[PDB]
Copies of this chain bind each other. A is one copy, B any other.
Amino acid sequence: DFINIDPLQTGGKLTEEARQALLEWPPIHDFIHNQLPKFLGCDVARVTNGAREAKFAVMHSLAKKDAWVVMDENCHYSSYVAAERAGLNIALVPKTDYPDYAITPENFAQTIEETKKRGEVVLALITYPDGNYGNLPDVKKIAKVCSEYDVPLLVNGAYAIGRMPVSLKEIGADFIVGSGHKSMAASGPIGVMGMKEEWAEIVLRRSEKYKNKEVELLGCTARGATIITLMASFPHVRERIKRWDEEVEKARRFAAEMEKLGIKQLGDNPHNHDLMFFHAEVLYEISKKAKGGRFFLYRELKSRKIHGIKPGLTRYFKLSTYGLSDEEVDYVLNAFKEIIEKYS
């Protein structure tokens, strides 16, 4: 019974219904042709083999010899690699400096403008929120920026869909991506892609031969424990997003608590996400004398029914407060206090 705090898993905590559902192993059509689009607040929605898989879909789908794409400096690495695999020139829109590391809609506007000078920017993309500091840029404004520049906007909602309530039509962006195995409590490699219909005959184009298969996805009907789980949990996730406010509240408390404890949280302040990135000079000093040194932390927690931090990290690290019940939160806060006093 390990209290998990790893970001990559608090949101992908597999549902009971989906757990059982995997044992015995459908409205698939109903799902992706009704439920799903409604949930992402958008016209067309499809299920892909993961977010990065969808992110590439549209990139490959709109790329152009010597074209460009603008993505925030906090872009997940798959957003960047999948740009490369599309052969796109990539321009990063710079982040604020410590402790903000924020993606301002203004820098975006410039980046987008500076780039265009260099060529055609076939696409724009913001990681909302970035998996780094848990920062939630101002898409509503950014999406405005992109629209008054005629450069499609893809939102990497990998860390928002399945957690916080979101709607493509709300935001005003053109595309939207989600990851079922980290935010939607699903399993295996699976993802969700949403778009304005206008971009269907573009991305969702069919083969010449097999008029029924969609080329950009390889005519995949992706049946497998993947969707199975995703669907099974979906009802849960539907209701889940309602408590977002308590989740941000909680993560906020745990945050300032750490504050008093001598370790700081950078980025959004107040923060707006269970995923927070901390600076703990103290734990770094200790690590210089501490038992295992660089690993004294992992050691200390792995011995307190706690795990979720890349073992070896003491100075900087990130963590989620998502599933964590107030008591589990407190327990974790206390856990820190202890390890602090322990070493001098």
Contacts and interface: CB of A to CB of B under 8 A. Distances in A.
A117 interface: no
Contacts of A82: 218
A6 interface: no
B224 A80 contact: no
Q: Which of A22, A85, A188, A208 has the most CB of B within 10 A?
A: A188
A207 B84 contact: yes
A183 interface: no
Interface stretch (A46-54, A120-128, A309-317): A46-54
Given A207-B80, A207-B84, A219-B81, A187 B52 contact: no
A220 interface: yes
B209 A80 contact: yes
Given A49-B53, A188-B189, A188-B225, A210 B60 contact: no
Interface residues of A, number: 32
Contacts of A208: 84
A128 B210 CA distance: 21
A226 interface: yes
Given A207-B80, A210-B81, A187 B225 contact: yes
A77 B188 contact: no
Contacts of A213: 77, 81
Contacts of A334: none
Nearest to A87: B60
29 contacts: A22-B22, A22-B225, A49-B49, A49-B53, A52-B220, A60-B85, A77-B213, A78-B218, A80-B207, A80-B209, A80-B210, A81-B207, A81-B209, A81-B213, A81-B218, A81-B219, A84-B207, A84-B215, A85-B216, A85-B218, A187-B188, A187-B225, A188-B188, A188-B189, A188-B224, A189-B189, A189-B220, A189-B224, A225-B225
